[PDB]
Amino acid sequence: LHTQVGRGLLGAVVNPLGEVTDKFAVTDNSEILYRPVDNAPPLYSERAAIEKPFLTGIKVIDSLLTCGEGQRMGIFASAGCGKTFLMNMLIEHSGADIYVIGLIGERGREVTETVDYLKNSEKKSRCVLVYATSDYSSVDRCNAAYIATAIAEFFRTEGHKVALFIDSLTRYARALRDVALAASVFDSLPRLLERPGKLKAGGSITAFYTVLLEDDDFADPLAEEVRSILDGHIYLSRNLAQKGQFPAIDSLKSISRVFTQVVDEKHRIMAAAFRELLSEIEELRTIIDFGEYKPGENASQDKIYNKISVVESFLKQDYRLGFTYEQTMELIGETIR
């Protein structure tokens, strides 16, 4: 019912029972307090409208899928699509005050991977990790997502800009199913997913939920439902990954529904002009695969063809590099000229 919260948890790895099991960092603060894990969602009059962008340092996100402070974003991907590396980039290149990571994973390796990453991360002293392996019960796996959320909710009350990561919603929903077997999956899923947001009287929780996909990016009832509740979704396509494009974000099938609210007019114009260029490039790729493209026949197709290298270089991003908003808008400008 209750877990420990506070700045004393910064740098600590917390198990599904609320105790500190490991540390990836030591902090100056020893503040430890207790709040209930089943907190009520914010009332509608207590939430602030999402108007400020949540900068991620990833070019394709910040330019075409701009997140907002208080937004809940879904990340849809199959295995081997760089989901974890995109998570690391969001932690490493964004500018949040505090990062709270909740692993509803399976094997102890996956937990140690993030612990080893955090131990060499620059955001080390601002991160809290909550984990739940496959060895833990279905109740403990569910409580992990709740403990991580309650920890994030305290830092928001203190006024901090918090970024919450739940990996994954799929395994949380599975554990939540077996919970009800003993007695939307109940639904108890929207309760967890409507707790983030920016509060008028405090800070914000910008939440990223991962949803696992099967095969050719197949969205089972799990993925379609979650897609409807959140304020947008980033989708990592398996085919962009095998082509060597990282991050494997298919921007044409991804969206941030608060995009028009968090960027100005000149940004919106550039983003629309670039998305049209992406649509033109995909229309040429299928013409090329059909053997119907020969240079010099269509001046419009030739102009689009010579833009592929410029567009591909903008989309790709080394996971160790982060870009400012101004750099992104400057790069997106040179691409559509």
Greatest C-alpha distance within the chain:
71
CB environment 72-106: b (16+ within 10 A), e (fewer): bbbbbbbeebbbbebbbbbbbbbebebbbbbbbbe
- Residue 67 marked as a ligand binder: no
- Residue 83 marked as a ligand binder: yes
| Alpha-carbon dihedral 67, 117, 319, 146, rounded to 10 degrees | -20
Can you tell me the distance from the alpha carbon of 46 to that of 192, in angstroms, rounded to the nearest whole number? 17
Triad 33, 34, 39: Cα angle to 5° = 135
- Residue 127 marked as a ligand binder: no
Closest CA to 233 of 60, 63, 67: 67
- Residue 85 marked as a ligand binder: yes
- Residue 80 marked as a ligand binder: yes
H or E segment and range at residue 180: helix 169-182
- Residue 70 marked as a ligand binder: no
Can you tell me the distance from the alpha carbon of 105 to that of 100, in angstroms, rounded to the nearest whole number? 15
User: How many helices, marked H, and strands, marked E, lie in the chain?
Assistant: 13, 14
Can you tell me the distance from the alpha carbon of 199 to that of 204, in angstroms, rounded to the nearest whole number? 6
Per DSSP, 298 falls in state -
Can you tell me the distance from the alpha carbon of 199 to that of 159, in angstroms, rounded to the nearest whole number? 9
Bridge partner list, 214:
218
Annotated binding residues for ATP, written as ranges, equal: 80-85
Annotated binding residues, written as ranges, equal: 80-85
